[PDB]
Design a binder for this molecule. Sequence first.
Ligand code: XJ0
Length: 274
Amino acid sequence: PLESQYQVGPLLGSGGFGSVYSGIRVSDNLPVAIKHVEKDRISDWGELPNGTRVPMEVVLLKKVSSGFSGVIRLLDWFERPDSFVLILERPEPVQDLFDFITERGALQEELARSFFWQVLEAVRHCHNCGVLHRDIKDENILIDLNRGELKLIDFGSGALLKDTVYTDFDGTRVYSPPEWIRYHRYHGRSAAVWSLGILLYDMVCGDIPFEHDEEIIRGQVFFRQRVSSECQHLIRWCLALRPSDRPTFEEIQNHPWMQDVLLPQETAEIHLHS
Ligand SMILES: Nc1ncc(/C=C/C(=O)O)cn1
């Protein structure tokens, strides 16, 4: 029935992933994010148990909709003549890593260590559920200013996790791995490590390292900011040209720089002064 259930608010954001609004659950007054998607702009649809032709983004979300707050949760969805309305939980207050970074420029390695770690745990959850985000970046990461927790959002570019090879891609280009930029071929797991490599750099440097294909294809990494001798390692390791030479989510978390990580609360209580 909608409407009588949710009280739509202002336009949070939009873009190629759709349009999101700041609505409230009339039921218990729970802050939620309403997302809209045109059936014409849907890259690839999915399938539900009860045999219902619904968007893939919905299929992916439901597969990761758990108590784990590492990823955005899908409260409920609806179908319309030429579009779908996804109801997602909405943190309050909250700010995406993109604006956060633009606001406070580069981030202290300590703070990064915390975020990046939470991200890994999140991504691991997705893969652990046969789900590949395929579009990991600062814009798709929210920050629960209070609990200092992070969440992954927008799965419109993701797809079912498979050990084979992906020939298609609809995520952000600057974050895409070199193997794709050239041969338009890549493997989820290995590719994910590359995007994370870019992200990690984006945090410690305040911006992405590569801007053009030529830069990506090459793979040479330069640090404009002061980064620990070890952090640079982990970063370059992920950004390894040859996928096979890239670190695994395990090796990444076992990396020296990924030690003595702060807790969600401590982090917010120190860097988010709450
Ligand atoms: N505040 C907030 N909360 C949730 C979202 C979800 C976006 C998305 O699922 O694409 C976006 N913004």
